């Protein structure tokens, strides 16, 4: 079958995952070019929620044009009843990738980790921190990861592998998103989140903000990357690394 998005018919190859009330289809228009169409039912979304899906597709509108790490949306149509989103069209999201993969390409890592950091940094130039950063925000296109979304949108098994201490010791700043890149790191080169291990989430939020639970740097052929982790996941957000300062580490700049 088809969807009709601003006077144009694309065709559905398949429906990517399966989600309830959003669904993500992998679609081909006219004349034969791939993309993904994001469908949203809106019938049930209060105002509220309304408000955050129009806020991140406004930034996404807007911040395209500044970093080709964030995914291209070429159109959207958006009604009363629904929303359709045409985008640039992805291989794989990080996570999925990950998950069937015993060893990463150093270079490759190395790649991606830019990638992550030109995203993010684009997001906080415009004033956005995404607080819920995972491998799954992102998505292999030719080679390249690209920020999927800005964690704007509202209510739409979760995970909090990735949680920065403040978010937990408070019960919020850019620093909150250098965590979590440094928990995705963590993952492409030790194969574990830092707290994989405690399975007890209750225990796992402890460990996470608890000084004297020491987080392990099993030592590795590139002492850059090992400082890079190190940096990223101290406990103090003042004590933290910034994304700037991450751009002029060494890991990404010396060859
Ligand atoms: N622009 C895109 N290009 C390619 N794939 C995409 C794009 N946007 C989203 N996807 C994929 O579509 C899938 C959507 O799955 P689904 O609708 O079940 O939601 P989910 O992301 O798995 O979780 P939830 O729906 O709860 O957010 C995801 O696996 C995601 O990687």
Redesign the pocket.
Known sequence: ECISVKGRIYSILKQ????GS???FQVLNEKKQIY?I?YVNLEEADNQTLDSYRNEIAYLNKLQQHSDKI?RLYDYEITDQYIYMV????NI?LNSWLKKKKSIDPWERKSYWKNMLEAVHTIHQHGIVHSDLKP?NF?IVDGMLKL?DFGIANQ?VGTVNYMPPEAIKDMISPKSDVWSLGCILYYMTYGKTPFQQIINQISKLHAIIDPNHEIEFPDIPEKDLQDVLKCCLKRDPKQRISIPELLAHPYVQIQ
């Open positions: 990517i995952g399966s989600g959003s669904k993500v993904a994001k995914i985008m640039e069209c992805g999201d799954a998505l999927i739409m």
